[PDB]
Amino acid sequence: YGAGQIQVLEGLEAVRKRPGMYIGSTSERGLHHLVWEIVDNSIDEALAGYANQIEVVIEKDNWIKVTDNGRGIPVDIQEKMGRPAVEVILTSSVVNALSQDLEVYVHRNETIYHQAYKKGVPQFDLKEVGTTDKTGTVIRFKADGEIFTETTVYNYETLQQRIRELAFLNKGIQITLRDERDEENVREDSYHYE
Numbered sequence: 261y262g263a264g265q266i267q268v269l270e271g272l273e274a275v276r277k278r279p280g281m282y283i284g285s286t287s288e289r290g291l292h293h294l295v296w297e298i299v300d301n302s303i304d305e306a307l308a309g310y311a312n313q314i315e316v317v318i319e320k321d322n323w324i325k326v327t328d329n330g331r332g333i334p335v336d337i338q339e340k341m342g343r344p345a346v347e348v349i350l351t352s353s354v355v356n357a358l359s360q361d362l363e364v365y366v367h368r369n370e371t372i373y374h375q376a377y378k379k380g381v382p383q384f385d386l387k388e389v390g391t392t393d394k395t396g397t398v399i400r401f402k403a404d405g406e407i408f409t410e411t412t413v414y415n416y417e418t419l420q421q422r423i424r425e426l427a428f429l430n431k432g433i434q435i436t437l438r439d440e441r442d443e444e445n446v447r448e449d450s451y452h453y454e
């Protein structure tokens with residue numbers, strides 16, 4: 261309960277109290293904005309010269325998974341908070357605050373690190389769960405139905421349109437959209453402009 265952790269909790273309270281001020285609306289438009297908030301991080305990492313693939317998956321029950329092959333959100337214990345950098349970054353994330361559940365897997369230092377959250381609150385300390393020969397960041401989230409009180413169901417065409425545009429605007433980045441909500445009938449569109 262240091263000043264750092266107190267500020268974190270106040271920040272989550274503030275986002276959840278006035279979500280529309282952060283993401284425009286809590287309508288279907290705001291729901292889809294959650295995806296762009298996450299994907300923008302991957303785009304910046306690609307433009308910085310450290311990533312070139314981004315994958316957005318609509319999973320069963322309208323979870324969203326975003327994966328990039330960037331450097332991975334750092335995990336070193338931070339000066340300000342005395343907590344892993346990734347935890348500080350995600351506990352101040354609007355998407356995390358407005359998600360009933362969110363998971364991160366960081367591939368970095370030939371290690372896979374995992375943390376989970378509910379409404380932005382970490383459920384356990386960042387944990388090493390395995391090894392890897394890749395780098396990057398995986399984020400999985402389920403939008404909070406307490407916040408998004410019109411719908412929590414994503415529109416494939418809405419995601420598709422903007423993903424295609426993002427690939428066209430940010431040449432060289434391979435951006436893939438896949439709908440896995442119905443395991444019997446899976447749709448994928450992959451964009452890569454030169």
Ligand SMILES: Cc1[nH]c(C(=O)NC2CCN(c3cc(C(N)=O)cc(Cl)n3)CC2)c(Cl)c1Cl
Nearest residue numbers: 298301302305326328330331332333334397399
């Ligand atoms: C899906 C996704 N991807 C990213 C992402 O790629 N973030 C970048 C931000 C800058 N990062 C680094 C890397 C280093 C480093 N030298 O490896 C040091 C620092 Cl100080 N930040 C790499 C991850 C985020 Cl954040 C989310 Cl959410």
Ligand SMILES: [Mg+2]
Nearest residue numbers: 297298300301
């Ligand atoms: Mg942002």
Ligand SMILES: [Mg+2]
Nearest residue numbers: 300301304305
């Ligand atoms: Mg950034």
Ligand SMILES: [Mg+2]
Nearest residue numbers: 312432433434
């Ligand atoms: Mg490329």
